[model samples]
Target: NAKEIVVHALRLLENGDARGWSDLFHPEGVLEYPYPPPGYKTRFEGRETIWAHMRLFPEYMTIRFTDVQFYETADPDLAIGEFHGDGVLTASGGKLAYDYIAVWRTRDGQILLYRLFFNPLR
Candidate 1:
């Protein structure tokens, strides 16, 4: 169930639904781009900051995921999912794609913390 949260997030991204994605996080939830991609600091904490960071995603970039691997931990409150994103940046003709993994921590069916890591394949 918690794992599905991440899948939904990716789907939202692929769908270019920023508002929907932002709604997924808990009020005080945390989102992190562990390896910040320029213009962003090392970590953007809090739901507002996180949502703001999410805005960085091109409003038009098409997305797809591959080789997705997910697992549930013994605690049941923690879930790990890894996958690769593939897509195109129509504006610059630059490909906006890479491999990423998300570590999700939930409490009572609500996500509390999420960490996203990706490789900027330039």
Candidate 2:
């Protein structure tokens, strides 16, 4: 069940559907990753909050995921994914690329938590 939800989310990403990515979450669902910590947790929350954070990406992050692979765990019901993406950054007037590892956790029928760890290109 959780795997299916994650699969759907990944599908949206593969299609470059940013707005769809936001829609995939549960209405009250929260999105988090590094950058904007939520309540001293170092992660953001809610679709709107995450969307606001993305706006800082030079308005053309050009984020395109390259390869992605998922690993699963049953104990805490976890999903891990590795991926890479690239985009143009107006601030740098060049290009920005990143490699990442994402962990997702779901409860009931919806995604309850997500975290991303990434490294920017040199």
Candidate 3:
């Protein structure tokens, strides 16, 4: 179930389904970017806040996740995924190729907490 959630989540993003992506989160879910660059918020609370954040994807660039590998954890509710995001940065025409790791916890079929780590230096 956890693995399916991650897979669906990625598909939602890949298809630019903002509503679907936001719906994956529990109502009070938390999304955290542990390594956000200086100006970005490190955490987003509530599903609406998360949804708003997700809507920014298309504004900045066209992104795609590839080479995904989902790992199961001892706890049934926890999942980990490693993937690559590649695309073009809209503003400066820069390339976007980065590896990312995410730790996700789900409850009642929705994501409870998500912590993500990635480098923005690419």
Comparing 1 with 2 on TM-score, the higher-scoring candidate is 1
**Candidate ordering by TM-score (highest first):** 3, 1, 2
Question: 61-106 in candidate 1: lDDT tens per residue?
Answer: 6677775698757767788878888888757576766877888887
lDDT of 1: 0.75
Candidate 2 colliding pairs: 37-42, 37-43
lDDT of 3 at 11: 84
Candidate 3 versus truth, CA RMSD in Å, comes to: 1.7
Q: What local distance difference test score does each model get? A: 0.75, 0.64, 0.85
Instruction: Give candidates' CA RMSD values in order.
Output: 2.1, 4.3, 1.7
TM-score per prediction, in order, is 0.82, 0.65, 0.89
* Worst window of 10 by summed lDDT in candidate 2: 35-44
The per-candidate count of clashes, in order, stands at 0, 2, 0
